[PDB]
Amino acid sequence: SAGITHYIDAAQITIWAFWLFFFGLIIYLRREDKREGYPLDSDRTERSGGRVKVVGFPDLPDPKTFVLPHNGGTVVAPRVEAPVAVNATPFSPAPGSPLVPNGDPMLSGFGPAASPDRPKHCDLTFEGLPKIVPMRVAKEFSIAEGDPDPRGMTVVGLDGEVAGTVSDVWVDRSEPQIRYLEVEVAANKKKVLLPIGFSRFDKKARKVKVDAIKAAHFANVPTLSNPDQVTLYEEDKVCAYYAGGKLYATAERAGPLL
Amino acid sequence: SVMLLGCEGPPPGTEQIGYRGVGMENYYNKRQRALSIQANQPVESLPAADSTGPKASEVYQNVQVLKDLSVGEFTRTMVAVTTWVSPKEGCNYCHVPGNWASDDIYTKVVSRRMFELVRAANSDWKAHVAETGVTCYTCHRGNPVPKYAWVTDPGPKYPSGLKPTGQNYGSKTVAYASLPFDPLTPFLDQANEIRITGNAALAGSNPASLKQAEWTFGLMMNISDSLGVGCTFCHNTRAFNDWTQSTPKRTTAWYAIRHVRDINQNYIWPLNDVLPASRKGPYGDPLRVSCMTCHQAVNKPLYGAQMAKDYPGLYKT
Amino acid sequence: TGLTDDEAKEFHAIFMQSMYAWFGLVVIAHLLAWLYRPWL
Amino acid sequence: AMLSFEKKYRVRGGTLIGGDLFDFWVGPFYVGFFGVVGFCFTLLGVLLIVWGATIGPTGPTSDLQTYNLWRISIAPPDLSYGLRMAPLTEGGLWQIITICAAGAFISWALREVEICRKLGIGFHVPFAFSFAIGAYLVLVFVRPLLMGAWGHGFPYGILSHLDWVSNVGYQFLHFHYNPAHMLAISFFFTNCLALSMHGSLILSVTNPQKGEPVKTSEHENTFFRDIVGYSIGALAIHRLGLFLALSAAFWSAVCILISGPFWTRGWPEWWNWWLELPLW
Amino acid sequence: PEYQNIFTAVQVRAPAYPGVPLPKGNLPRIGRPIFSYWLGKIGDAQIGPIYLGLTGTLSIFFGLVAISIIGFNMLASVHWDVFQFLKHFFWLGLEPPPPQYGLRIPPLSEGGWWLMAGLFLTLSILLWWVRTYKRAEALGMSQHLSWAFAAAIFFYLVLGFIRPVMMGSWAKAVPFGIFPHLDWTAAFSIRYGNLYYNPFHMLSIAFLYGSALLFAMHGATILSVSRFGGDREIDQITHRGTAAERAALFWRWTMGFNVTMESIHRWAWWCAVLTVITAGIGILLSGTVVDNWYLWAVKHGMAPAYPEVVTAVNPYETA
Amino acid sequence: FTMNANLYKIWLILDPRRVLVSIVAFQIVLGLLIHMIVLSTDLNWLDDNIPVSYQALGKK
Amino acid sequence: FTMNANLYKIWLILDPRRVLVSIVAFQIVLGLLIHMIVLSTDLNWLDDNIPVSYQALGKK
Amino acid sequence: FTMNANLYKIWLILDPRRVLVSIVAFQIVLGLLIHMIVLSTDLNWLDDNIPVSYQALGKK
């Protein structure tokens, strides 16, 4: 790696042989690292790097072609995606600064609650049935011999107050497991789905603790179109709503601690 | 299998061997070091003698080495020896009830050699033993047969032909490793080249074998646990063979590696002819000497205990 | 299991004759070696 | 400059300390309290590391002082001072610089914390990163402390900190026999065995043979069920991995810690407890 | 069961999934799937069925010979005394043929069994590689796994095929032993001047480390985003989602840049597969091309310089 | 099988299939295990005395 | 023939697929574990005694 | 092929394709093995003895 060389040998004739392949592979990768996102949006802080450049060190790659399975469309990577929308205003005219959520941040659909418009279709299994469905349809699925049953437990909330009770849980045909919980909100008496990721258990009191949002927030949760299957579009917009709680369910959360 | 969590406690000893932050550091257990010293103590030297009167060869008829000395000194060197070798069986050990000069009991014969043996060490091999020296105690420590003596280890059991594989057994010889575990014979007893570290940048110069180095590693292990230290002591691991860097001790030990040979090749091996069965190994070879024999897990036998100095008969005349 | 008494006894029979097929072919095996190289 | 889907995520809040003040984005990075902190350590240390290359073992005019990235080295002070600050020249730099390492590593984690706090994501990453930092807190704090000398640390030299690994290693003879060390190693290997396996499968299902559709989790399971029988599971691997990774470091931390403070003899020998068992 | 997506709180079970339909010529899966509540509390509970065709059966039988041979000799040295066998297990091991045989076929005693059990373990892997190749195309899958497994195999053979044979001595080969093989790598290094200065050996570590690093990030990230369905990478690779939609922003804001849900897995691959790549090489060079990587480094001004507070003489030149 | 008469009861809780197969294994291993263990130190007809001569005599 | 009386009922709880398969394996490995260990033992036949060393004769 | 009569019934319970592959493979190893275990001991025919040393008339 020295600037000047006075020594030559086979050992070193192969080392550089690697770095070249390396410097090349790292680029190969970078190219791929841009099949989702780029180009960038603004110029808040002029692309930083040993060598600036227009759009990174490596020019964007060629659109790959993804043939979804039967009864499916087609995806291209990368792809020219139409600009999204921001339901928030700039906390400051200075670039980089954050964007304050308008109205109730719990549903402003921004940041934590913000979710992209995923395909308004539904994921399926190998054969063609909706991958993720409620046990009210999964005639084969049963609770593991021994493990306590969730169906019937009362879903508590952040503040502690009860928000509703589980009426059913959504299992996954493709990958045997519990992914959602058909929760029955008390307030709106509606039926919203609850994601495992946020679903906590207290087998002692037959509950499904949730620190995401308050019991009251469970009310206006992104409803589902068909109660016999969850759409990818909504599915992602579902558990995203809970995320908001992770940062909006309480002014204290977003507020500093020190 | 399982993971260690603390068989020894903090804070362990520390000894900075190399430049600041070179890795070369010695870490020793505090308590253990204590007990070692305590239980590993010498024996107060006997009262000085008149050193006058007649000479040994003068009155005593059958004396071949301690002649130079006088009577009181010689009578003294006779006492010391008995307390250091067979303080259990008295003088009758290397003699005959009455025949203070007979050479019927083998214990005497060897004692003669052993005498020259010691002397030599203190007189001609001073680069190793320094101005300190060794006495019959250093090896015998009060026992007719030195506890830490060795022999050509037979190895593992006989599968009826494919038994030669003598590297699969944790022998206390090599600090409980899985090496040949018998480097003492091929090295400490023989003279097999210990060096294998190529001295040239590229290949084609050193034909050393990979197994060979395993062997050296063997010996080194054993040596390491003999003096009871860590390779850092003698070297800087990134320069196992660069002496220009490695440590003064490294050389000091060098000589010993031969001082030991000497002790086996010109003293301990010849006496086998007279030594009995219980003193001979399975391969017919006699109990020889090793770094472990004297050092016995201490870089400096008896922690620099200077015994020989007070004994003039224990030096070449 | 997976069968009744009928199919069961039939198997056992043929299955035996096949086992004595071994013991005999192996015992005769041992013996042939026993004569050649005596162990013990 | 933001990604096609960045703007809708740059929300305000979720800060631990003095967030509103530094609550903003500089390019593709985030600052906040901890943001500025780390930086205050970066240059304050990165430059000192350079000052070391500048100065050298003895002096800037010496023949030792070099700039070869390989030969560059910043060794700690002697074991004499123990828990005392040695002259900036004779070990001082290392000591100070190291204090900047913790200020960079820890803060970097803390920074990640609230960063996740904004995305409402899980605090897995940081908690995971903790171990790495923890392992560091052992090779410079924990161990040295129970050894009574900040000089027990490792030199900050691209190749220099390898010798420190060779000596301390052989300091216990054949360092390959360390229980915790072995165990840990296994993990590092398992982990790599996991990546080579995970990453591979994904690319093998989303980019199948020519004229083939994107496989589903239906295949993934069968695939490893036909080569070895069982399939851990989708997120399962993402769990397993995370485990191995951390476990690899954890057991390692133990590996070096036990070496010295909890054991001075030679590791190869430690295994004797198994031998001296009244069963053989 | 602490839920940070660590342990599946509540499990459910469905009829044993007998894998997906395979092509013509591929034998039907075998083995009645099993269920484990505990195991399943970690990930998947169902077990099997497993495939086993020609290559498979030919493999499971092949390598199973080597293992036996090895474990055999091991229990042989202990004089078939299991007591001392389970005692010295770690130490026990099948040693390679003595240098007094070069590459020639030694007697079962002096190194024979090793070689035999070796070829049976060499092909056992080579064969197993095909076994995997047959499980990929049979499912229309690619060969990313074979490519990797290949790379690993590469370094595997470097320890016997390409290097030892290139040296002309079966002595330079790792032995069949838990502990003794640790000594092999222990000796090898000593024999070749300290692998710390061996270039490739370093590059390979960067991977043994990088590897651990990435998965620590990925494995984690996916979990942290497991809420927004971040585990279902497949449908994420096809049509990007919210999981991967924040999952990157994190890294981006943290380290500046980032990659895609798919992309990363590609890095991981090359960060792991390249591990052994720099492995077989670093060893393929040692013994043959270079003999002392220490002097080799300083030869190119690599080896750092340290003051001389300690130094030893040299009785050789002196005497 | 004298007092074993009452033991009849054991079958309802000690599953037949399992008990038989499993047990059949325990011996398989043990049988070898023992032969191996005795074959180790006690006496080794295979490599101890006669009629073995061809081994030693035949070799040299 | 004695025991063969009621031993037929065995297949009524133990599947034949089981025995047949395991049996082959055991008898296979087991067998190989004999010429093997015994081979390594004194009564070796390949290179122990006779054929008397011809290698030595023919080779040179 | 006499006993072949009663032996025919085996095909009705075990999948023929299995016993074939299991064996076509089982012999594969056994063969590669024997020449090996033998060539490594009794007579290393290839280069241990006869014929005319490739070393003597060779190397020189």
Ligand code: BCL
């Ligand atoms: C003679 C030498 C000995 C030996 C002596 C030692 C010694 C001595 C030690 C080890 C340690 C380790 N050895 Mg060992 N080891 C030997 C042979 C081996 C072999 C082998 C195949 O032969 C292997 C696989 C290992 C494996 C290992 C690891 C398990 C362990 C390192 C653990 C770790 O994860 O730290 C994880 C990481 C860290 C501590 C660093 C923290 C990372 C920080 C927070 C991030 C840095 C960011 C940076 C500033 C930014 C860079 C970006 C730039 C700006 C561009 N050793 C030989 C036998 N080994 C060490 C150990 O046990 O550690 C616990 C140790 O102290």
Ligand code: BCL
């Ligand atoms: C774990 C046990 C030992 C140890 C044992 C080893 C061994 C053994 C080896 C290394 C190797 C490396 N070690 Mg180390 N190392 C230790 C602790 C550290 C620490 C630390 C903060 O504690 C750091 C920053 C490093 C850094 C490094 C890298 C220079 C090098 C590449 C490793 C790698 O690819 O990881 C995977 C990760 C990445 C590729 C990404 C980020 C790492 C980057 C490339 C390294 C930047 C370091 C930089 C020079 C520090 C100054 C930054 C200034 C801003 C300029 N080590 C501890 C003390 N280390 C290898 C080497 O080749 O050394 C020469 C090697 O073989």
Ligand code: BCL
């Ligand atoms: C060491 C001194 C002697 C010696 C002393 C002994 C002694 C003493 C004994 C043996 C015994 C045995 N010895 Mg011996 N043996 C020697 C040298 C040898 C050598 C040799 C190469 O030198 C060999 C190959 C053997 C080989 C053998 C085995 C045949 C036998 C172990 C049977 C078993 O494990 O059943 C394991 C069991 C089972 C699988 C199942 C249980 C059996 C039931 C009752 C039947 C099965 C029922 C089933 C449910 C129905 C379905 C049928 C099928 C399973 C489908 N010996 C030397 C010379 N040997 C043992 C023996 O012969 O027992 C009769 C014994 O006690």
Ligand code: BCL
């Ligand atoms: C030890 C000193 C002697 C010696 C003594 C013996 C003795 C003693 C015996 C052998 C036996 C054997 N020896 Mg010998 N042998 C020596 C030297 C050799 C050498 C050599 C190169 O030097 C070789 C290659 C062999 C080779 C062999 C094997 C042919 C045979 C092992 C059979 C077996 O275990 O099947 C394993 C078993 C099975 C697969 C299953 C059981 C068989 C049943 C009956 C058939 C299966 C039925 C099935 C359900 C129907 C479907 C059919 C097909 C499977 C599709 N021997 C030396 C000279 N050898 C054994 C033997 O042949 O017994 C007959 C034996 O007892």
Ligand SMILES: CC[C@H]1c2cc3[nH]c4c(c3C)C(=O)[C@H](C(=O)OC)c4c3nc(cc4[nH]c(cc(n2)[C@@H]1C)c(C(C)=O)c4C)[C@@H](C)[C@@H]3CCC(=O)OC/C=C(\C)CCC[C@H](C)CCC[C@H](C)CCCC(C)C
């Ligand atoms: C069990 C934990 C595993 C792990 C996980 C892990 N690492 C992580 C993370 C996680 C989860 C991050 O989130 C973070 C990251 O990459 O975030 C984007 C990171 C990271 N892991 C890194 C490195 C790293 N991890 C390692 C290991 C591991 N990382 C484990 C396998 C290793 C090694 C030795 O194997 C290295 C080298 C970094 C790339 C990055 C953290 C970067 C960071 O926070 O840097 C902060 C500080 C600076 C940029 C400035 C430093 C200047 C100081 C003033 C001086 C300090 C001197 C220094 C000590 C000298 C080093 C000299 C050496 C060359 C000898």
Ligand SMILES: CC(C)=CCC/C(C)=C/CC/C(C)=C/CC/C(C)=C/CC/C(C)=C/CC/C(C)=C/CC/C(C)=C/CC/C(C)=C/CC1=C(C)C(=O)c2ccccc2C1=O
């Ligand atoms: C001698 C000489 C002439 C010198 C010239 C010197 C010159 C010109 C200098 C000027 C240039 C300068 C100053 C450059 C400075 C550049 C700097 C400081 C950069 C700092 C950033 C930094 C420290 C980055 C560290 C990055 C490292 C080491 C990462 C290690 C892990 C790794 C392989 C990451 C690459 C792949 C990525 C991005 C993984 C992260 C990642 C993971 C882990 C997911 O799981 C995941 C899941 C879903 C979507 C995305 C992701 C995702 O991106």
Ligand SMILES: COC(C)(C)C/C=C/C(C)=C/C=C/C(C)=C/C=C/C(C)=C/C=C\C=C(C)\C=C\C=C(C)\C=C\C=C(C)\C=C\CC(C)(C)OC
């Ligand atoms: C008795 O045993 C029973 C029945 C109870 C079963 C139990 C078995 C047990 C317990 C087995 C345990 C085995 C263990 C612990 C094995 C451990 C092995 C280890 C640690 C191995 C480590 C490293 C091994 C390496 C690197 C091996 C490399 C091998 C190579 C490269 C082989 C190459 C072979 C070649 C090239 C062959 C070429 C063919 C010829 C020679 C003909 O070409 C000229």
Ligand code: HEM
């Ligand atoms: C206190 C008890 C002992 C007494 C009184 C004693 C006395 C003597 C005397 C007087 C001599 C010289 C006499 C002669 O040869 O003419 C002598 C010689 C000798 N003694 Fe002792 N002795 C004692 C114990 C021992 C012991 C324990 C050993 C053995 C290790 C020993 C070994 C010898 C030897 C080897 C010689 C001959 C020395 C030579 O060759 O120069 N003695 N002893």
Ligand code: HEM
């Ligand atoms: C000058 C003082 C010494 C005397 C008088 C002496 C005396 C003896 C005697 C009498 C024996 C035979 C013991 C027996 O088996 O009955 C013996 C054996 C032996 N000595 Fe010494 N010895 C002395 C110094 C040493 C030293 C310094 C070493 C160490 C290297 C040593 C190593 C041995 C060994 C290895 C044996 C063989 C073991 C044995 O005989 O049981 N001796 N010594």
Ligand code: HEM
């Ligand atoms: C367990 C750690 C140790 C290891 C791995 C080790 C390794 C080695 C190696 C590989 C050599 C051969 C160098 C060459 O090719 O020239 C060697 C030589 C040597 N070592 Fe060590 N050593 C260790 C500990 C020690 C200790 C503690 C001492 C000091 C008492 C020591 C003293 C020597 C001497 C004197 C030589 C030169 C021998 C000769 O004349 O050939 N070593 N060591």
Ligand code: HEM
């Ligand atoms: C081949 C194995 C041996 C090795 C490697 C070895 C090595 C060493 C070393 C390195 C020292 C210096 C320790 C220090 O500086 O603190 C030393 C000192 C010493 N050794 Fe050995 N030695 C060996 C065998 C022996 C034997 C068999 C004896 C017994 C007669 C012995 C007696 C001594 C004595 C008396 C000292 C102290 C000298 C002093 O204070 O400087 N050594 N040995």
Ligand SMILES: [Ca+2]
């Ligand atoms: Ca070995």
Ligand SMILES: [Ca+2]
């Ligand atoms: Ca016999």
Ligand SMILES: [Fe+3]
């Ligand atoms: Fe993944």
